[PDB]
Design a protein around this nucleic acid. Structure first.
Lengths: 534, 465, 465
RNA sequence: GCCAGGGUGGCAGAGGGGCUUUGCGGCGGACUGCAGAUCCGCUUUACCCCGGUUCGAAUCCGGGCCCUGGC
């Protein structure tokens, strides 16, 4: 709450300690669900793939390369100008863009159409043979809210969607028709085009890069490869170039990601768009990989490939200078940096069942169901736990005044009791605390037996009596409204969180089930509370 | 050059001022092409599209959304599950994938498609978590989408980036969408927002929740466009329809907001044409600053000896004080030795009734607005000298260097005398200067011009012995 | 080199394979010191302290706090207003500012001080806005503070960075502080948190709100420290006391959390000693990778002509196939012309009963763990070759280059014959290799060693005509 | 890619032309119980996809994928 500055100044100038101690008045008295870890702040997380891409952007920029966007959709003739005869082997690993043709409400389906009773559903209107011909002309998708809402009446797609189905089964026939347009299978297909417009009009050397998507089919599988991927690619254009420029670039780039040693071998492919014997494979050493269970126990892995474009290919775009091209597969680098073994799990965690909450997250999700809506009710609960803690060993029978006071203008006295004999006020598990440990929720007592849990898990800070007490106070609080006079509520054996006035949202419950985790919250609570409200 | 601290240490103990002035000794004596602006550092420049994408990632993270990668290649059945009946119409704007049948040609279409907006992928992603993670769930993704919009290019491109998000919670309304748009857009300088119901009313959104967002940006007021009032349509959102959510077993409403990246970038970096912005190389938008061009203007022939330099330097020296004197007339510029013998350099003019040097000997080469000029430092040309970038190389300067290296070639040639004169300047060559063939092609492409002309009329003679 | 597209275009129309193989023609023929790893790119490396500061800015922004700059130089009366009585004690740890009295020597202390924690400045800043901005107000600042803690250095430094924040609202509790710590710390990989009441109970915080925060980081489990269990004290917070707030006319409670930057950075980048981390140059922590050192190992004398190269190359060539042959013995390695006359190069050995080349002629120079080695590629040394970085320069390689350039000097010297032989290698010099004086000083400083020894025993003769 | 044994319900694991395990787990209810148990009720009739044999196939045959002891 706010306070008065002047008052505090004048009281502090005279009696400091008194003012300091009085400061506690401005603090907020929080109800159970307003206490840590039940309250928190959140923040968004980055996906490992995009994080890596941004780092790669920073790394290429730091070594002098400028950012560029290369063509992605390209006529397959480019793969031919680039590979020659070997092109066919390539294109067999590519995807072609196919598209749907427009239906014909004539010729094909009109000789046998106007030879029958067209439409019956009364919407009549003049021959829209034109508003339907324009569909062979220029149209779109949302154009449906047209030849209906402003034609045969009927706003939006109320009858627009259905008038189509039960009048023209012609649309339901359509099949995509391939084209010669293809999706680049590597940045290279697009570099040539981009370079043909500037290799001779810009100051040498020219250093450009681009980290973007490519596509490439592979056995028609996911566990063997992905259909789309990212290539962190670059090109260097200068008059004099050799494999050494590829090496120097690979090192300057990779060194910024923690690699410390490199080895290069000649690639058996010897692809046609590269000068013979220039296509090099690059192997790098990363500490994070040593001692790893992976196939890279020694810390070495093939991380990139490069070469020098064949003048045969450069000519096809009229490029007069040699160019060095280095490409790095982003997915693999990301796996290394953020510790992943399976590509699929790394980029598509949600789809592959790799979701997770920390113990801390689960603890935050465990709430108190019934909670006193009155400041006194809270006091009542606090006192119940209080007296329950003081006289938990008193032999049965017994009774204790926990709270005496006014509530709703009706005096009240609440008691903790034990009817049955040959036992004590509180059951043995009354002080059990709820704690989350390794994905499970446990209802346990602080015993050397469970140190591990209280030490490595996250205690919710709520015990059986705490949860029950809040339940009770709310109960008497309710009776004090039903114009009642005597209230009694008891707890016997505990089976679940419910029996402790605790709960978790339905999604969290499912998460726990899905993760094969368990909820073990049991024990003999046996606590009773009686109230007399006048 | 490296020096010895003790020398300077004690040498400074005797006389500080002398030690201080002595310091010039360690400086490097730079030759023509090693002088600013002919020497410099370079660095990468980022592209406006990707810079914007990165700003968008930051902005989404700033408001609590976590990054995700959504399915890009998808079975067309997903569009069917999401749009319902209106689906056939939608698929028309999509691209299907085709593969070449392994010849034991003609590509065979499959039933796979590229997503046309992020939504096609969101449903798939949400299906695995909407019932297993604490609410609210706030995810975003800035990635590529493909669309066959009319099949043109003057209006739209085949691929584009969608900066998209989804918000999953028990209770949602069109208000959550307005709150997200403002919080995201404010971080980009927009100050006011207006929302209007989108007439199309797509079937994957709950009827009447599909909204168009308009935002006001001061940067656009007074803009050579209809955006002159400062307002512009910048995004769209809606609450997913239970019809569609149900086909994926998602039991809660979902607020989806998508913003087209290309338009934001154009605004942030001042572009009018999308294609000129993302593909500048392909659309002739290459560009070099005046300072860049100036750096490319180099001296072709330079004296190879420390002697040669002080010679060219002296040639220049005397012409700066005797270019007036009537001709015929002659002056001694240098006298000393190099390569093993003494030499004398003369700055002269044999012709009668004229001046030693031409009236343009002092013209300076300066770049301005993409053009290279050879001009005098006159009040008439002030603006060029103050707003362009002068090379610091004058007509004589370029010539002297040639002269020097020319006698330097005579010395090693065993000669004893050399004649080197300059009359009328018609280009960079005539003044011992050049630019790489690519910069020249650049200037032509940008339709720039080179105007280096004038009466140099300066002659130098020397006799080695 | 630049080429003509038409040539390759049509030339490829006739025979692709031939055109393709012809391509090697455009590649550059690199000489010794232009070969990897002797050539490379460099780039800046950021410092761990500043990287951490930048990560902290991001983290605070991630949870909604806005950046601020707080007063750093302050009148000591502010510490008095904030700590009350306990103030005299506090001022002991602060620094006061003194100025030299303008001599019409001895500095005169003023009543101004440097802040010892961010709090001294927060109150001033809050005084101008806590009653004029919508609640809650969430501000942060990562900046320098000064402290005279005991006046040592083995335990603490004079200046340090505090990553601090304040949260102003009508209702606050110790819970808001716990929520902020977790949200901030989780972004740095901490997974579990514990809080304990700080015994000192400073008077500027409401009694009993001053809390110490402990966090668990997996990176620290199994750490060569008491942090072995994974836990460590990482920050502190409390709710400002109305006594202090009132001296600035602030009427609402304020949650303040501060985290020491140096400790976080040490954890993030793996350091044990604060000073070694922020001042590595001053504490001898300079460091070069093996690959860096390898790049600095250069060939001193290299053939200046394309002819010289193919000569040194041939010298090497025949020794790789006749280093066995018994001596005396002789072989012709090269025959052709350069500088105007033909020449013949001989690889020989005059001595009796021995081999042409020494048994170490094929030893390779390789760097490993900061040391430079001259060794044979034997199973015995495998680990050095696979985990260190070999230069790709062998004993003969370095020598041949010397040989070649040596006859090359005879040719221009008008001679007709030259004797150049090598016996026992004792260092990089004996093999025509060097490293800049600074790298050598580096290796000594790092107590590294250079071990380039062995029986080269190889002689080359040539006769120019 | 070449040899072989095989692909069962949430997990586990028998079986084998139509009827058919079973254990764990789980969900709902019951219980005078002072500690982590008891009893009753419970499913989505489970055995990949395409063909073939048959009145009928998860069980028989051929092919396509998916796991494993092998080059």
């Amino acid at each position: 709450m706010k306070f008065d500055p002047q008052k505090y100044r004048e009281l502090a100038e005279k009696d400091f300690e008194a003012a300091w101690k009085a400061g506690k008045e401005i603090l907020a008295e929080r109800s159970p669900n307003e206490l840590y870890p039940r309250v928190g702040f959140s923040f968004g997380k980055e996906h490992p793939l995009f994080a890596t891409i941004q780092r790669l952007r920073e790394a290429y920029l730091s070594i002098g390369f400028s950012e560029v966007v290369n063509p992605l959709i390209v006529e397959d003739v480019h793969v031919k100008k680039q590979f020659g005869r070997e092109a066919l082997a390539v294109l067999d690993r590519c995807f072609y863009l196919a598209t749907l043709p427009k239906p014909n409400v004539g010729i094909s389906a009109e000789k046998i159409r106007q030879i029958e009773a067209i439409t019956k559903r009364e919407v009549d209107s003049k021959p829209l043979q034109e508003i339907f011909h324009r569909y062979k002309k220029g149209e779109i998708d949302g154009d449906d809210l047209s030849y209906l809402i402003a034609e045969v009446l009927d706003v939006d797609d109320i009858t627009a969607v259905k008038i189509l189905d039960e009048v023209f089964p012609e649309f339901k026939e359509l099949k995509p028709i391939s084209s010669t347009l293809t999706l680049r299978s590597h940045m290279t297909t697009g570099w040539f085009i981009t370079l043909s417009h500037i290799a001779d009009k810009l100051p040498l050397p020219i250093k450009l890069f681009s980290i973007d998507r490519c596509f490439r089919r592979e056995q028609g599988e996911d566990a063997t490869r992905l259909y789309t991927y990212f290539s962190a690619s670059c090109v260097l254009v200068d008059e004099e170039l050799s494999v050494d420029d590829g090496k120097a670039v690979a090192e300057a780039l990779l060194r910024q990601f923690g690699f410390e040693n490199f080895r290069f071998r000649k690639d058996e492919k010897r692809s046609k768009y590269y000068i013979p014997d220039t296509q090099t494979e690059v192997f790098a050493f990363h500490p994070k990989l040593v001692g790893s269970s992976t196939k890279y126990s020694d810390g070495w892995i093939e991380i990139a490939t490069f070469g020098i474009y064949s003048p045969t290919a450069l000519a096809e775009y009229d490029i007069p200078y040699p160019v060095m091209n280095l490409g790095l597969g982003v997915e693999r680098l990301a796996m290394i940096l953020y510790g992943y073994d399976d590509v699929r799990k790394m980029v598509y965690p949600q789809i592959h069942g790799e979701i997770k909450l920390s113990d801390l997250d689960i603890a935050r999700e465990i709430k108190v169901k019934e909670v006193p809506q009155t400041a006194v009710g809270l006091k009542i609960a606090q006192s119940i736990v209080e007296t329950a803690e003081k006289h938990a060993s008193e032999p049965s029978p017994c009774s204790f005044l926990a709270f005496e006071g006014e509530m709703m203008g009706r005096n009240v006295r609440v008691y903790v009791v034990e009817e049955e004999e040959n036992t004590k006020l509180c059951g043995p598990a009354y002080a059990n605390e709820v704690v989350v440990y390794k994905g499970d929720i446990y209802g346990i007592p602080k015993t050397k037996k469970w140190r591990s849990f209280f030490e490595e898990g996250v205690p919710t800070g709520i015990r059986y009596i705490d949860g029950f007490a809040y339940y009770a106070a709310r109960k008497v609080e309710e009776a004090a409204m039903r114009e009642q006079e005597e209230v009694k509520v008891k707890a016997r054996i505990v089976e679940n969180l419910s029996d402790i006035n605790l709960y978790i949202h339905e999604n969290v419950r499912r998460y726990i089930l899905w993760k094969k985790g368990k909820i073990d919250v049991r024990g003999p609570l046996f606590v009773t509370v009686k109230a007399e409200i006048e």
